[PDB]
Amino acid sequence: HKIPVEADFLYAYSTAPGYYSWRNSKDGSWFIQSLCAMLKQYADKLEFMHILTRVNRKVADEFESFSFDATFHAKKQIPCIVSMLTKELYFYH
């Protein structure tokens, strides 16, 4: 038994491939904001992929950019979970 050298990585990207990612100068980034909130609420309750799915929903639903520049105004964001994990991950044992 060998395992792949790329196995057991998880990349929690704030945004989809090719896209900008949004940061609020007062509140912090949409993604990190949301990630911490969902970890605080669900780390004792949900498997990590399901926590990150809640983060995806929070960013997708609850945030929208506000800009005086029409190019950058009213824009949305979806984070991007990239999993090469081979097992479920619970922060509690």
Add this chain to the structure above:
Amino acid sequence: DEVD
């Protein structure tokens, strides 16, 4: 709101 800014971008990264």
Add this chain to the structure above:
Amino acid sequence: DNSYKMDYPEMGLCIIINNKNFHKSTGMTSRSGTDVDAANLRETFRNLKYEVRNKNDLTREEIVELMRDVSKEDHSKRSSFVCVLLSHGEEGIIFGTNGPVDLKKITNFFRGDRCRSLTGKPKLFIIQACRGTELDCGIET
């Protein structure tokens, strides 16, 4: 055995790289609000019992050196590894204060064959950075 073993003596390291101020010559803006992120992450992962280390405003050289050094620690008593990157970025790239670092260069240090004390353990990279310049216009529901 469908779940990672997370009852080692330690949960593991949480490395937070918080790049806010960039060298003038790079032309990259200051990332206002990122300290709020770094503080939130520190508290959050503290409560998950991670050994958190915050690093601020690292050059590309310092990022690679930090990652190399951390990957050469003995993680035998640790369940997992977490690294959070807060910076400017493009697809596949994170910025040090003085220029870019390939994300592959960073994560390669922790490959199953290159960091043996993390082989079979979850290695989490959390990345707040752009991946390009596209904007999502959204759709009303």
